[PDB]
Amino acid sequence: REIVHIQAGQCGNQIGAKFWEVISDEHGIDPTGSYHGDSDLQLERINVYYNEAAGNKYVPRAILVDLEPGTMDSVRSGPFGQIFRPDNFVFGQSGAGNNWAKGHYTEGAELVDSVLDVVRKESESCDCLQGFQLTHSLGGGTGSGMGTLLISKIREEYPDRIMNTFSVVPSPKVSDTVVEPYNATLSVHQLVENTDETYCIDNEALYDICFRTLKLTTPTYGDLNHLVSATMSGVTTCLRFPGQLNADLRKLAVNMVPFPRLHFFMPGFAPLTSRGSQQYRALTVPELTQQMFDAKNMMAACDPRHGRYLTVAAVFRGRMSMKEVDEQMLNVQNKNSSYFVEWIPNNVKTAVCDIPPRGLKMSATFIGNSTAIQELFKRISEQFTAMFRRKAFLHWYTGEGMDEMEFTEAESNMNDLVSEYQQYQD
Amino acid sequence: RECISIHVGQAGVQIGNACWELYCLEHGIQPDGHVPRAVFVDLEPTVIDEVRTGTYRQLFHPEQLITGKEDAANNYARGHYTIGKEIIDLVLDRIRKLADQCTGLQGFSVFHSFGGGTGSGFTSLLMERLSVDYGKKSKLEFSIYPAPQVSTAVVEPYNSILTTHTTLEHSDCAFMVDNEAIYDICRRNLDIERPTYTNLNRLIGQIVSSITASLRFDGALNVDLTEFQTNLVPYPRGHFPLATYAPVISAEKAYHEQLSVAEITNACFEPANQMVKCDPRHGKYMACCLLYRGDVVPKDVNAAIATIKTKRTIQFVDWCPTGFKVGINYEPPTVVPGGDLAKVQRAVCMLSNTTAIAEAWARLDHKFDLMYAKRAFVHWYVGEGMEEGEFSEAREDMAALEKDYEEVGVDS
Amino acid sequence: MKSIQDCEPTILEAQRGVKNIKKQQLTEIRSMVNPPSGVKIVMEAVCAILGYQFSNWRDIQQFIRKDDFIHNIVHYDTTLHMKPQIRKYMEEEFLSDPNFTYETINRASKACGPLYQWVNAQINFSKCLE
């Protein structure tokens, strides 16, 4: 069963830091790595995510990849730094120059072996290795270029494990680098063929939700990450606790992807509320469904209603009646009936774990697979062409040995992918 | 004497787990007396783990809780071929150390579901391997079939149409029940708003007791498994009766204890207690086996059946003159403390074969079709060893099972 | 006549065949970790034709996994009029044995057929070059 994390890049590293913060807490593991959790129930699966080093330290099995040494020295100095094993840190040395080509050839191309190794040293640890999580960001250096190179090696090494990817897709209307379309497109092409689950988080949609749904003054990058990290825990770990209907990753995936061109989901979390108005009653389930199916609770910026959904999968986690669950689901399919592709009979794939996530009385992740996500690759595709046309920064790529024709490819390719997505919209 | 039991799947173990309690409780088995007689198989550890852990640890002798470590999944193909293959052996072996142990057993209660991954796949080839080693025993399966509206999967139709054609030709007798139709009862005739897979399981846990446990209690007019198959097929096709159990009444809202044979018996025929979302009110019955248990004196019974026989709104297929085997076992129903049901003194587990189930296949056939028309999730199956044959040809089969249940009405 | 004419509607045949192969149909094909035997054998025939010779399933995954998977198929040779020694091989290994037959494979997978025709064409053409 066990499974193996990978944090590439600055974002991808940062998030990591909250994520192991989360998980750890959900098994009551100290920062030192010694267990002090609440109930035995915990401990039983830990395995999934840890390794025991010597009856005390449970060390996370992760890999931390980055070319800029300043990175790693912030994470190991964090509140949960102690918990790794130093080997796990694989830095580069060079800068992560924001150039996909510099990542995906050249510099990253050097560093690869010093990763690939470690992944085998880790794989041959135990059990049946389920898969890899890869978190990383499409904007930075190491992420789109180099990290997209990485997978292609993993997917040659174990061409049968799953690959979850959390990409921090760049929010086209709230920019932060001027190469964005180069860094996005060059990777997406590679991505769409080698990974089994991609979870797109539009960075500002993430903003929004914190400033408007939860309502905080100041959304640090730190916050956001914190919120995200609940969702990728909200998928998996969760199922690694006994429930009423345990169905994870494999199941999960194979409930979702009808055609084989991968498809990307859009995560949505659920009992998320302002601090003050947390006070007003709820938590019974219709609110959770209330949440989830709203556009302002998508962590991805396309708003569903401009698409339909193809499959949707709610992984709940508390104590409750399956009838009031199954029931909701139904209603939802009738109230928003035009938002569903028809030739799927029943869309929702309910799964229901048990254990609650710490302070909450019960929570519930949503993973929706909508055609609304066409409207993301459009944006990207636009930006690209518009500047490809004038070859704007092109030389920094060209100069590393990338032809232009790759630039055609990726574009072509990726544009056609938008195409697909509509064909099964209407 | 006894008759072994097989729980397969994410689901199936849960059912077992309830039931096996009740079952034991009924004989008053100490939570430490003579060891159970069954097995539990499933590939994803997590379910079985509970049973190695929760109360009822002692109760089984480990060997018989077989588990995979590998990814079960949720899709026939895999479950049939690929993964499941590995396990089969180990399993078969156990049932032969347990088959050879017992003397003069009778058959296999399978609990498999078309939900969980394995439930379909596995079972399919398990039942195959059974049919060869024990070609003559009895193979009665309680399956959980997927409701019309509520569903919790999207491979649902696929996952059950692949199981059907094979199970037809390996099984003797299939009970069907479905979740959706069970909840209803829990609201209406039992009045709770908390159903969980753990409540419904307590329920099925009753219907099953009416076969074994109680039969293992002598009374006025005991019945037998062959007796079933005999009285319930009506042609040689592994036919699909539907089950119903009847004095389901909420304790405390049962001071209404002026409650008799006549009522509980009449209380079966209403489609309100249908037990699967098919209303037989426009089907034809064709053979019913009313098993009673508790204080029942034959006559009443044999009168209450007359009344039914004369209620007219029920139809009954022509060419059966009489179709009511009657079972009386003695032993009052027993009630689990965690349960809801009320400690009645007589109950009726009537089962019966009806041309109505034409319904139930249709809604499910339909589903399948749509999707197959797009070739929807096909690559998940293909890529596991399944063939496109197995698809087209498992439709066609079930088509011609829909023809039998159609034909078998209107014979004159 | 100036044309040799021998097996020309085989080169209109192999050609309609290569346009019968859809790129999404390749993606569906590549995803299958372990498909029926009927699927496996067709893929072996493709390694031999493309000139990657023999392959075990493990190896086939490695091949298709390449980025030139679609590219090489859609860009493939006009005529393999050069007669490789794959010519007698592809028969001794595939056309020799009836397992490799349109029906078997087709029933195997509804995705195979066009692929099966295309391979067939590269063979029925290879007979006329002798």
Author numbering:
A (entry chain b): 2 to 44, 47 to 360, 369 to 437
B (entry chain a): 1002 to 1413
C (entry chain M): 3095 to 3224
Recite the paper's sentences.
Cytoplasmic dynein is a motor protein that utilizes the energy of ATP to move along microtubules (MTs) toward minus ends. Within the 1.4-MDa complex that constitutes the dynein machinery, the heavy chain plays a central role in dynein motility. The motor domain has three structural elements: (1) the ATPase domain, composed of the six conserved AAA+modules (ATPase associated with diverse cellular activities, AAA1 to AAA6) that form an asymmetric ring-shaped ATPase domain; (2) the linker domain, which transmits the powerstroke movement to the N-terminal tail region; and (3) the stalk region, a 15-nm-long anti-parallel coiled-coil structure that extends from the AAA4 module and contains the microtubule-binding domain (MTBD) at the tip of the stalk. Furthermore, the structural mechanism of the two-way communication between the ATPase domain and MTBD remains elusive. It has been shown that the switching of the MT affinity of MTBD is achieved by changes in the association mode of the coiled-coil, referred to as “registry”.
